[PDB]
């Protein structure tokens, strides 16, 4: 009773309904928990979102960080399946020795939502819960479709800006934030041409000069800094105020967990939808 799952790091074959699942990555944990599966070990991250709070405790042994698996502990846990997010993917070859391993991740080229659907469908196949997955997909798909229509019918541009340690970077349609353009129906204020993993460095002068109609802001420090203060107070300086986005009240502060950390999560994707509705 095996299934063969195709994912970013190739093909993995395993018996359906693995009993002992180890999960690395918040997005993988989000979708897995959301569909009613309880893992035996999980990565630990200081920024784990409230909706996954139970996994922060020692009830669940640490499988490592978001980036670096604890191979020794994972082996000790005797997993039937290891599910990892893209952050840990350099360790896939090593994890694949221990047990069938699947990568759970979005793809910029095919687009966030099309690829995320497949990730949930992959879970559906592994755990024989296809109907529940399809019900969820139908629900969320309608939300994507409605938002996209809106933005095409009021065809307008958006600039996606991330702020981290004082660095402002921008990302376009062929980036980890492909959802904004390919799924939610915005056009790029400025075509960021061929992209790169970590975005392109910009400045407040760039934001003001290019004058986006909609400005979507990701405060990376929210989930990385020990503090949780509001970037808005500082982000909205004179240069940003002079922007159309500010005036039209279309600066949106995206949920950092949902958009940046918990990639392809169920709750994460629902939050992305909520954020887009709001803006």
Written account of the structure:
Keywords: Ion transport, Iron, Iron transport, Signal, Transport. Its main location: other. Belongs to the bacterial solute-binding protein 8 family. It is found in: Cell envelope. This protein has 279 residues and is an alpha/beta fold. The chain folds into 2 domains: 1-150 and 255-279, Nitrogenase molybdenum iron protein domain (Rossmann fold), CATH 3.40.50; 151-254, Nitrogenase molybdenum iron protein domain (Rossmann fold), CATH 3.40.50.1980. It is 39% helix and 18% strand. The protein contains 13 helices and 12 strands. It has helices at residues 26-34, 71-76, 92-98, 112-127, 130-153, 179-183, 204-210, 221-224, 231-235, 238-241, 244-247, 256-261, 266-278; strands spanning 2-7, 10-15, 21-24, 41-42, 81-84, 101-103, 157-164, 167-171, 187-188, 200-201, 214-219, 251-253. The strands form 3 sheets. Strands 7, 8, 9, 10, 11 and 12 form a 6-stranded mixed sheet that branches. Helix 1 links the parallel strand 3 and strand 4 (41-42). Helix 4 (112-127) packs antiparallel against helix 5 and helix 5 runs parallel beside helix 13.
């Amino acid at each position: 009773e095996t299934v063969t799952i195709e994912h970013r790091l190739g093909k993995t074959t395993l018996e359906q309904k693995p009993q002992r699942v180890v999960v690395i990555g918040v997005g993988a944990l989000d979708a897995i928990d959301s569909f009613g599966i309880e893992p035996v070990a999980v990565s630990k991250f200081d920024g784990t979102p409230d909706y996954l709070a139970k996994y922060k405790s020692d009830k669940y042994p640490s499988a490592g960080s978001l980036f670096e698996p604890d191979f020794e502990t994972i082996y000790t846990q005797k997993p039937d399946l290891i599910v990892i997010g893209p952050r840990a993917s350099k360790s896939y070859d090593e994890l694949s020795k221990i047990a069938p391993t699947i990568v759970f991740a979005a793809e910029a080229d095919q687009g966030y939502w099309e690829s995320t659907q497949q990730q949930w469908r992959n879970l559906g196949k592994v755990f024989a819960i296809e109907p529940a997955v399809e019900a969820k997909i139908e629900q969320v798909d309608a939300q994507f479709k409605s938002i996209m229509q809106y933005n095409q019918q009021h065809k307008s541009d958006a600039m996606l800006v991330m702020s981290s340690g004082g660095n402002l970077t921008t990302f376009g349609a062929n980036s980890r934030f492909s959802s904004v353009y390919k799924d939610f129906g915005f056009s790029e204020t400025v075509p960021v041409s061929k992209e790169s993993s970590h975005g392109d460095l910009i400045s407040f002068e760039y934001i003001r000069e290019h004058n986006p109609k909609t400005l979507l802001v990701v405060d990376r420090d929210k989930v990385v800094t020990k503090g949780e203060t509001n970037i808005r107070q500082t982000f909205e300086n004179d240069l940003v105020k002079a922007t159309t986005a500010y005036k039209n009240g279309h600066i949106a502060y995206l949920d950092v967990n949902a958009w940046y950390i918990a990639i392809s999560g169920v709750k994460a994707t629902e939050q992305m939808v909520a954020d887009m509705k709001a803006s």
